[PDB]
Design a protein around this nucleic acid. Structure first.
Lengths: 145, 95, 22, 80
RNA sequence: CCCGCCGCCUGGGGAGUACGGCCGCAAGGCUGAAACUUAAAGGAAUUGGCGGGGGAGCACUACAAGGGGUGGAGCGUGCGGUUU
RNA sequence: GAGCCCGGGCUCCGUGAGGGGGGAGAAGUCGUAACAAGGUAACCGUAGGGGAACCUACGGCUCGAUCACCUCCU
RNA sequence: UGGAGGUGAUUUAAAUGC
């Protein structure tokens, strides 16, 4: 007998087996409880605006060294401290301290910061409801306050 | 013809004050501040840097008053040249 | 190794369990 | 009271230079326990060698400061 | 190769740990996560290098045996350093 | 027959000195633990001891050691 | 020709290296 009971009336055993053994998929367990949804702030969401507390630059990882542009932003309803990775070359410039900065994830919600960056779970898109890739190109719009 | 590199831009002379381990050293800088400084791997594999050495420090663009990279370490003869040229003082070296 | 760990785990446990017991 | 002490560098093995501590009254002070405590402060190897403690590496200031912490007179201690 | 049942597993490390409960005189046991982090953890065999691994065989930049000598001095020379 | 209130008990949310560990950074220090019999084979459960890697006892195991010595087996 | 035990075992050869 390769595992399983096989027999007309047994099925229930089957039926509980699977479920018992389903909870060894971390991902499945996690969603079905909602640990994905509780822990890594957002309250689950696509994105979150937040006030730029300051600008900080951190070091790169193991084979690497280079100053990544990171913000510290506070999500507003979430009310949680988030350090964050900023796309683009010049950028850290166009972000004034205490402009609104909308924030997203970057590269699988699992926790995985991209290979270079240690911490950074997240991405920035915006400065005063106009984005960073729009501010890398000179023409498209340029910033205020 | 002796030639000795000099700090450029916002770089500063500094005297290494303490080895902190793993490519980090505290450096007493010519602006009177101590900075916690990284030795880049490229420099780490070229020179031996010790407490008391005179170095060039590049302050980081953020927390410029507290952090930097060591970008050059002077030899003793170069230190003597810098003294003679007035780029540093003996009082600064000794601390 | 597992010698190590068992006694480290035990010492951690005891010392901490000492700190709980106290 | 009246307990003086000398702390100085002493040749050792791999590393650079050991650290020697002498001058304790061995009838009152247990060097074995002192050494164990000092070894934790410096995180290095060490032994009681006769009426002295020898620590691997240079830990003169560390040791002096710890001895003061432990109740030994600041003025009884000399680092050479 | 088939047929019947049962236990257990579901990448690594965190951790066989925390908490909770149960058991145990105590020492402990049984049960048993998560936050976080990683592009590996691993297994077998192949080759090579290696071992204060084993056998066989040579060598004269080998060692023994042996003859001479360098290292002591003065000088010649090239260098390290210092001086310029 | 509601809301309302009062005294106590229990639980949960926002937040706090202090405290634990992880994956790391790999230029300081101590040692040589394992990986070659790693230079005292190694692991293993249990117990004590040591700053640390770890050592030792007792029992087990070979995922065990290199010839040698003795014993068996296609 | 290839496999399993039982016990002598050898201290004359030294720690580390980004």
């Amino acid at each position: 007998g390769k595992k399983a009971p096989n027999g007309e009336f047994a099925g229930r055993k089957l039926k509980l087996k699977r479920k018992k053994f389903r909870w060894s998929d971390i991902r499945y367990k996690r969603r079905v409880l909602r640990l994905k949804e509780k822990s890594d702030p957002l309250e689950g969401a696509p994105q979150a605006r937040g006030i730029v507390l300051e600008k900080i630059a951190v070091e790169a990882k193991q084979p690497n060294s280079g100053m990544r542009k990171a913000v510290r932003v506070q999500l507003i309803k979430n009310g949680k401290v988030v350090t964050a990775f900023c796309p683009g070359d010049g950028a850290i410039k166009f972000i004034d301290e205490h402009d609104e900065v909308i924030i997203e994830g970057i590269g699988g919600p699992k926790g995985g910061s991209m290979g270079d960056i240690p911490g950074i779970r997240y991405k920035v898109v915006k400065v005063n409801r106009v984005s960073l890739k729009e501010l890398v190109k000179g023409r498209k719009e340029k910033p205020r306050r | 013809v002796i030639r000795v590199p000099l700090p450029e831009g916002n770089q500063l002379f500094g005297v290494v004050e303490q080895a902190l381990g793993a490519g980090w050293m505290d450096v007493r800088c010519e602006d009177g501040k101590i900075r916690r400084c990284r030795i880049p791997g490229k420099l780490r594999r070229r020179v031996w840097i010790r407490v008391g050495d005179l170095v060039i420090v590049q302050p980081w663009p953020v927390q410029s008053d507290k952090r930097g990279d060591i970008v050059y370490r002077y030899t003793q003869t170069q230190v003597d040249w810098l003294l003679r040229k007035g780029k540093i003082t003996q009082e600064f070296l000794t601390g | 190794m597992r010698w190590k760990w068992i006694k480290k785990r035990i010492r951690r446990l005891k010392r901490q369990r000492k700190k709980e017991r106290g | 009271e009246e307990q003086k002490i000398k702390i100085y560098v002493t040749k050792r093995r791999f590393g650079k230079l050991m650290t020697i501590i002498e001058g304790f009254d061995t009838s009152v002070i247990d060097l074995k326990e002192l050494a164990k405590k000092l070894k934790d402060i410096c995180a290095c190897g060490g032994t009681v060698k006769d009426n002295t403690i020898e620590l691997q590496g240079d830990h003169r200031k560390k040791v002096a400061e710890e001895l003061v912490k432990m109740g030994f007179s600041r003025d009884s201690i000399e680092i050479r």
